[PDB]
Design a protein around this nucleic acid. Structure first.
Ligand code: DUP
Ligand code: CL
Ligand code: CL
Ligand code: CL
Ligand code: CL
Ligand code: MG
Ligand code: MG
Ligand code: MG
Ligand code: NA
Length: 334
DNA sequence: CGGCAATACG
DNA sequence: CGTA
DNA sequence: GCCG
């Protein structure tokens, strides 16, 4: 089993679901406490189990697996012997974990804000709603639409939203393309949002696109919220983090939609980064830097010795530049 | 210990 | 601070 | 928390 997640296929569904889920609780809790190193290790150990070809049924099978030390192995030992891990269960039940999970899952709220609120004594969504003047516009939107944003996004929602975005993008710029990215590109059946990457075959024509797209969506009454970021080789892409009004039979629900626009020259890097998973990209970038001495981000791949950027016409190019066997998106579910 | 992905945007 |  |  190789050490980096980008060196091994990791499918969406696998043979150690229970064990990985327990380790991911501990990762999540580590994050709430500001222990980013511990979070990373628990995430990696969970991912190692996702990549295994069959179920772990005995402690000996952890021998030699990367990222399994005393702590992670104990967790798996307890699950194997008793069906539960007391540490995991204590985390689950704790007021601190449940409140941080509640707060951090609000759009516009991160660990530091959730922690401050917790320390201030706040515990519920209604507690936050009673102090509106303190909230950012993004947080106000996240709270306003919290129930809907907590509802899993389904493939049928994706299909509908893709048609809407394709229509608006096609109205805003002839020849522009829309590519589904994020978790649904990796084969996920449900998600927290829908992510789309937009480009145009003639380099430069994609500039100045999202205000036109957003105007056209607003004119259809589809936009409940959005936050636009202008673009800057480009080292920042134009982006819009949106909440769409999605029609449902006799009603509607709010859905988070992210739009990002890249020049076609950088499209493969953007697609790679935005397709994830988050752990897959952290691992891939770590591998690039530490093993190959190349610096990878959403915009490109830089050789610091030669001081040159790699051109890429595909994700396959990028894996080749890094000396990695190609993994399709469905196997990037680290 | 030194590291842990990435980073301009607002 | 928070965003992908 | 794990790695080197
Ligand atoms: O911290 C991050 C967040 C996201 N990303 C990349 C990978 C992720 O798959 C992609 C889309 O971000 P989302 O927050 O939309 N996650 P994803 O689409 O994978 O799952 P979901 O939207 O269902 O939570 O952006 C990172 O690289 N680092
Ligand atoms: Cl830590
Ligand atoms: Cl899924
Ligand atoms: Cl981006
Ligand atoms: Cl590609
Ligand atoms: Mg997503
Ligand atoms: Mg997203
Ligand atoms: Mg230390
Ligand atoms: Na959040």
């Amino acid at each position: 089993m190789p050490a980096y997640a980008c060196q091994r296929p990791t499918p969406l569904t696998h043979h150690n679901t229970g064990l990985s889920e327990a380790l991911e609780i501990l990762a999540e809790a580590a994050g709430f406490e500001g222990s980013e190193g511990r979070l990373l290790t628990f995430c990696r150990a969970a991912s190692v189990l996702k990549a295994l070809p069959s179920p772990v049924t005995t402690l000996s099978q952890l021998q030699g697996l990367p990222h399994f030390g005393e702590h992670s192995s104990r967790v798996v030992q307890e699950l194997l012997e008793h069906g539960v891990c007391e540490e995991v269960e204590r985390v689950r039940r704790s007021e601190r974990y449940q409140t941080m999970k509640l707060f951090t899952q609000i759009f516009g709220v991160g660990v530091k804000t959730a922690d401050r609120w917790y320390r201030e004594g706040l515990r519920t969504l209604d507690d936050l709603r009673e102090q509106p003047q303190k909230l950012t516009q993004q947080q106000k939107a996240g709270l306003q639409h919290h129930q809907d944003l907590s509802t899993p996004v389904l493939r049928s929602d994706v299909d509908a939203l893709q048609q809407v975005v394709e229509e608006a993008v096609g109205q805003a710029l002839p020849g522009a393309t829309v590519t589904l990215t994020g978790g649904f590109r990796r084969g996920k059946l449900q998600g927290h949002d829908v992510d789309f990457l937009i480009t145009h075959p003639k380099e430069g024509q994609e500039a100045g696109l999202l205000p036109r797209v957003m105007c056209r969506l607003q004119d259809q009454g589809l936009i409940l919220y959005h936050q636009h970021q202008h673009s800057c080789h480009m080292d920042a892409f134009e982006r819009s983090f949106c909440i769409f009004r999605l029609p449902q039979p006799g009603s509607w629900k709010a859905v988070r939609v992210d739009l990002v626009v890249a020049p076609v020259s950088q499209f493969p890097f953007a697609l790679l980064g935005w397709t994830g998973s988050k752990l897959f990209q952290r691992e891939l970038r770590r591998f690039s830097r530490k093993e190959k001495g190349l610096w990878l981000n959403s915009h490109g791949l830089f050789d610091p010795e030669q001081k040159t950027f790699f051109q890429a016409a595909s994700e396959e190019d990028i894996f080749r530049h890094l000396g990695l066997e190609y993994l399709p998106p469905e196997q990037r579910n680290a």
